[PDB]
Amino acid sequence: GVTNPLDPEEFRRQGHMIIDFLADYYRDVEKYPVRSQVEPGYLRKRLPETAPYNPESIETILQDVTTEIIPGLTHWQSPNYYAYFPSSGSVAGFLGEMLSTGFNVVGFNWMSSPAATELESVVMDWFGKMLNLPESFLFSGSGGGVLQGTSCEAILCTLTAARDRKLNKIGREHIGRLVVYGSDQTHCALQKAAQVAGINPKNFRAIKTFKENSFGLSAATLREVILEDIEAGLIPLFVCPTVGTTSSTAVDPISPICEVAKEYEMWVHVDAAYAGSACICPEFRHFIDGVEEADSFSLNAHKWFFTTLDCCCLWVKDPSALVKALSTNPEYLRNKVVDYKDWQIALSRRFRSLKLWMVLRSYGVTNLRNFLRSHVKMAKTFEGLICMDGRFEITVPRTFAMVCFRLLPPENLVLANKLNQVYLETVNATGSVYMTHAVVGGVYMIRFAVGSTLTEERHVIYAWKILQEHADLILGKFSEADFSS
Amino acid sequence: GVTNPLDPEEFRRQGHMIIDFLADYYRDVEKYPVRSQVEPGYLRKRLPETAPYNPESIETILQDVTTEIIPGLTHWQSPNYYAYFPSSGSVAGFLGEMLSTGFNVVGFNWMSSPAATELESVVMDWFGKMLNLPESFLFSGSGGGVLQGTSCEAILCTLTAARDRKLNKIGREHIGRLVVYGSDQTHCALQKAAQVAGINPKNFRAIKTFKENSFGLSAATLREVILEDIEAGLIPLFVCPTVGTTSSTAVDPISPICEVAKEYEMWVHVDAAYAGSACICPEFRHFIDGVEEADSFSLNAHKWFFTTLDCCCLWVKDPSALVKALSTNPEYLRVVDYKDWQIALSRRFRSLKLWMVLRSYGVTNLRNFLRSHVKMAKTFEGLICMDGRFEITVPRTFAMVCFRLLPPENLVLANKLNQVYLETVNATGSVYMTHAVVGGVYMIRFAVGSTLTEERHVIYAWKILQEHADLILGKFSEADFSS
Numbered sequence: 031g032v033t034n035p036l037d038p039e040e041f042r043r044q045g046h047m048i049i050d051f052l053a054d055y056y057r058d059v060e061k062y063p064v065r066s067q068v069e070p071g072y073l074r075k076r077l078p079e080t081a082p083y084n085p086e087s088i089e090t091i092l093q094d095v096t097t098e099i100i101p102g103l104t105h106w107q108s109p110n111y112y113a114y115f116p117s118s119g120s121v122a123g124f125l126g127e128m129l130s131t132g133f134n135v136v137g138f139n140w141m142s143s144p145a146a147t148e149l150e151s152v153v154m155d156w157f158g159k160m161l162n163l164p165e166s167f168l169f170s171g172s173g174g175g176v177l178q179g180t181s182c183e184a185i186l187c188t189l190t191a192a193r194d195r196k197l198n199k200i201g202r203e204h205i206g207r208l209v210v211y212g213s214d215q216t217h218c219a220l221q222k223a224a225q226v227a228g229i230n231p232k233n234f235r236a237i238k239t240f241k242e243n244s245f246g247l248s249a250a251t252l253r254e255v256i257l258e259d260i261e262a263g264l265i266p267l268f269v270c271p272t273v274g275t276t277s278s279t280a281v282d283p284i285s286p287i288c289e290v291a292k293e294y295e296m297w298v299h300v301d302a303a304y305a306g307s308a309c310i311c312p313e314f315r316h317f318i319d320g321v322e323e324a325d326s327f328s329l330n331a332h333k334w335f336f337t338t339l340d341c342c343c344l345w346v347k348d349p350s351a352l353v354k355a356l357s358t359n360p361e362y363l364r365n366k367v368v369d370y371k372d373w374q375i376a377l378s379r380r381f382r383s384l385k386l387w388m389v390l391r392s393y394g395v396t397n398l399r400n401f402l403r404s405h406v407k408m409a410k411t412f413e414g415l416i417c418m419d420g421r422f423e424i425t426v427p428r429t430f431a432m433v434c435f436r437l438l439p440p441e442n443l444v445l446a447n448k449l450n451q452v453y454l455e456t457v458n459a460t461g462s463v464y465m466t467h468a469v470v471g472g473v474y475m476i477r478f479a480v481g482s483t484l485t486e487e488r489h490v491i492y493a494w495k496i497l498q499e500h501a502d503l504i505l506g507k508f509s510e511a512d513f514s515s
Numbered sequence: 516g517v518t519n520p521l522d523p524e525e526f527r528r529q530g531h532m533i534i535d536f537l538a539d540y541y542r543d544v545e546k547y548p549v550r551s552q553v554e555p556g557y558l559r560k561r562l563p564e565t566a567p568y569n570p571e572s573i574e575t576i577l578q579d580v581t582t583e584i585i586p587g588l589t590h591w592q593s594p595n596y597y598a599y600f601p602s603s604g605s606v607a608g609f610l611g612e613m614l615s616t617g618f619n620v621v622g623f624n625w626m627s628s629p630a631a632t633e634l635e636s637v638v639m640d641w642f643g644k645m646l647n648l649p650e651s652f653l654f655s656g657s658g659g660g661v662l663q664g665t666s667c668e669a670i671l672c673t674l675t676a677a678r679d680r681k682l683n684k685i686g687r688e689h690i691g692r693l694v695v696y697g698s699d700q701t702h703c704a705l706q707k708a709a710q711v712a713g714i715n716p717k718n719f720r721a722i723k724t725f726k727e728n729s730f731g732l733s734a735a736t737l738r739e740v741i742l743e744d745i746e747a748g749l750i751p752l753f754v755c756p757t758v759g760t761t762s763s764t765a766v767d768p769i770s771p772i773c774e775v776a777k778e779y780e781m782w783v784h785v786d787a788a789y790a791g792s793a794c795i796c797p798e799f800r801h802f803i804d805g806v807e808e809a810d811s812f813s814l815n816a817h818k819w820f821f822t823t824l825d826c827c828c829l830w831v832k833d834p835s836a837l838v839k840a841l842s843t844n845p846e847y848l849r850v851v852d853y854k855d856w857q858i859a860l861s862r863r864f865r866s867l868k869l870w871m872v873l874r875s876y877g878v879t880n881l882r883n884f885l886r887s888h889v890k891m892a893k894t895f896e897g898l899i900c901m902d903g904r905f906e907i908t909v910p911r912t913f914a915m916v917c918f919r920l921l922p923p924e925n926l927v928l929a930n931k932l933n934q935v936y937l938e939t940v941n942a943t944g945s946v947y948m949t950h951a952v953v954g955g956v957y958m959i960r961f962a963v964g965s966t967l968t969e970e971r972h973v974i975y976a977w978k979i980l981q982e983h984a985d986l987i988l989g990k991f992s993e994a995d996f997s998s
């Protein structure tokens with residue numbers, strides 16, 4: 031006897047085990063060290079080298095999940111986790127994938143699941159109006175929205191949409207002259223997107239940012255660089271302002287960047303990946319002011335909107351530009367029911383809209399706003415606690431729920447960077463908290479970003495006390511010779 | 516106060532609701548019409564225009580799933596679903612993504628979750644040895660395997676690394692001379708991959724296939740086209756032999772194609788998205804014979820390996836080529852940085868999906884699972900051969916039959932006959948199959964693969980095909996299809 035792999039009753043049986051296994055996880059997630067403490071190669075030695083010929087009980091697999099898999103996790107959901115940007119999830123977002131995985135439809139056209147395409151077009155207008163985007167970006171007006179996996183894939187489709195738009199006008203042999211623009215703080219997804227699309231690696235620009243502008247891109251400096259490319263015979267094509275960069279959570283001013291990009295007929299993709307979600311709150315919406323002149327806008331719902339990884343939201347003014355670059359239909363039908371596969375790189379589309387649908391319904395706009403707000407006040411609190419300690423300084427202004435700081439010693443920039451390097455890694459090696467760094471403007475600053483869904487105010491104070499405890503211990507036995515190397 | 520959106524008790528309470536909800540769905544899934552019967556725009560009318568300002572009870576949400584979302588589903592998981600290619604699911608694969616959604620870790624480097632990277636390299640060697648792949652593709656030898664979301668992006672990363680392999684030898688100004696090769700049966704993922712990767716639209720070849728070899732690509736025909744392109748000033752770059760094409764499950768001979776591709780220093784990517792999973796069985800492994808002389812191999816483990824959607828398995832012989840092409844570190848610089856093997860930076864715990872499926876079912880049963888699918892299709896093929904008014908159009912290779920109803924200029928007539936006949940079967944909502952036009956002949960595809968599909972469902976589908984064959988042919992007139 032061999033029970034069918036999709037037995038409804040065995041599905042129910044084993045399914046409840048995991049739901050209780052994961053509920054127990056979120057309950058006791060505080061007890062593991064946040065950053066994993068295993069050595070590289072630990073798993074190849076604790077597991078067999080071949081697949082088993084006969085079945086293994088789930089009660090055995092779940093046990094090995096506890097002893098082999100779990101010690102090899104860096105607990106992104108731990109309430110004492112602040113590294114990088116949040117992997118923000120929720121119950122509503124979790125059950126979104128569960129229904130999407132249970133149904134297991136492949137929405138590569140409208141017929142394969144009408145609801146999997148039409149619902150995505152509804153909730154992208156829900157989230158559009160919440161962000162108060164102009165009618166040019168959503169389906170009520172003359173635009174559209176698509177759900178994908180990464181911003182990097184979303185930036186790519188946009189880049190090739192802009193690229194093909196230009197090369198269709200002037201010719202394909204000029205791909206070696208197209209230039210892609212971003213600041214030196216723009217995330218490395220823009221560079222990778224350029225590399226894949228056939229953009230020349232010598233034609234990728236990392237415009238310099240200064241501390242005077244808090245490391246935001248200067249429309250003056252950008253246009254300076256463009257004139258160099260035009261004088262050199264290059265074709266400027268694609269510029270990517272960022273609202274909430276990865277290192278110093280810096281913000282670029284889009285309204286004068288579209289000014290410059292309009293002059294030289296460019297594409298303005300605006301990349302709020304992390305910080306885009308906070309713009310559903312009126313007090314933060316000013317950060318994407320000037321997005322009405324850009325060609326596309328990108329935010330990542332798994333970073334700061336409780337929809338589980340992965341879920342990336344792309345809005346475009348001209349969804350036909352993606353159709354003409356990504357559809358495999360002949361080039362005389364792309365200019366003539368939504369076929370969302372022509373808006374992205376993934377043909378086998380997933381029922382990703384169920385995640386967003388359940389998050390917006392199960393919490394509503396009012397509570398969804400306060401969630402993001404609470405993460406901002408918690409970091410705002412952390413920023414104020416830093417300020418009342420004369421041993422720390424704030425390196426750059428806080429914009430959205432992430433604080434950058436540094437423990438100054440009693441050029442010394444080399445010395446203050448080795449101090450923070452040793453101070454940070456000592457706090458991180460305890461396993462009690464986890465937070466990363468960034469070298470911005472030569473300074474070595476520690477990044478404290480609050481966003482874990484299970485993070486409460488008591489955890490920020492716990493991290494503050496641990497930062498203070500090591501501050502005492504590090505500076506108490508201070509000696510330049512220990513850090514002057 | 517305000518309940519936390521990740522409360523353990525609220526997680527577990529609503530978590531068991533959906534588990535019962537889906538087990539209920541898998542029980543009654545046979546009652547819905549397989550192909551959706553809603554009209555375009557049905558859901559914008561039944562739903563609000565704005566997101567709610569106040570939370571809605573999970574109980575009320577699930578009622579709108581049954582009454583508004585389920586009518587808009589084409590039941591890929593129905594036991595009577597034979598359209599396109601299977602969406603192979605299983606309990607184990609479901610628990611793999613739910614375990615990987617509960618942790619919800621981002622695997623963009625080894626430290627963000629070592630097990631997310633380490634486990635991915637064990638299961639891909641488990642699989643690799645299970646398909647009897649050469650040691651050149653495994654981590655034990657001198658290769659490597661990476662799990663990606665789709666084939667279109669797996670074919671991409673190899674395409675955008677084969678290009679970088681050659682363009683870094685001859686200079687990047689020759690991108691307009693690189694030719695991408697495939698048959699006219701090769702899936703449109705190769706065209707799209709070449710489109711995104713900068714290959715010129717004029718330089719995509721869809722080499723012709725003939726019925727004389729069941730529409731598999733001929734290395735002789737491939738070589739004729741290559742010399743044609745060399746004398747045109749072009750540079751042959753990349754060939755993609757397909758094992759089990761989407762239209763008629765044709766097989767391109769891999770070994771002679773690599774022979775031609777080594778003459779002209781080409782990249783041979785084997786596409787086995789559907790068929791590859793069946794080479795676990797030693798009696799099927801001969802289809803990817805010659806993969807030892809290729810550069811990359813890819814199968815989708817959502818079509819025929821019970822891992823739900825999505826799970827694509829790429830085995831590259833030289834993982835340096837991907838890294839050197841997809842990493843963003845300076846070119847003088849390029850543990851496992853798996854993100855440098857694909858287009859996705861924030862990578863997910865796909866390994867659990869493939870881990871549970873291999874572990875809880877075992878090698879012995881997994882073969883019998885695929886063997887069962889093939890055998891049911893091999894039985895449906897035998898039923899067609901007893902009804903004298905049907906014709907098997909092309910040889911059945913894996914678990915999919917291509918048949919057509921014959922009538923009692925003639926091709927146009929018969930092609931219209933099967934179109935009307937097929938859509939009358941599909942419109943009942945009882946069963947669901949799709950078609951293809953291979954060699955100008957309209958044929959019906961019967962793809963057995965749904966995990967819930969038993970033998971009585973195939974026999975049930977045979978009866979319905981016969982009741983409509985009796986029906987359309989009983990009142991046959993040339994004029995009804997001469998239009």
Ligand SMILES: Cc1ncc(COP(=O)(O)O)c(CNN[C@@](C)(Cc2ccc(O)c(O)c2)C(=O)O)c1O
Binds near residue numbers: 115117181219275302
């Ligand atoms: C500002 C910005 N834009 C784009 C991206 C890349 O998009 P993606 O990798 O999702 O496709 C980033 C990347 N940010 N990634 C982090 C900050 C780490 C990270 C944290 C939480 C997540 O949910 C993800 O996916 C990544 C990194 O350091 O690389 C970005 O910041």
Ligand SMILES: Cc1ncc(COP(=O)(O)O)c(CNN[C@@](C)(Cc2ccc(O)c(O)c2)C(=O)O)c1O
Binds near residue numbers: 760
């Ligand atoms: C032989 C072959 N190679 C590649 C692809 C593209 O892979 P992906 O789209 O997964 O990146 C295909 C596509 N096949 N897709 C179907 C058969 C529809 C389909 C059926 C069942 C599924 O689980 C998926 O994902 C798609 C099509 O007809 O296009 C392919 O056949």
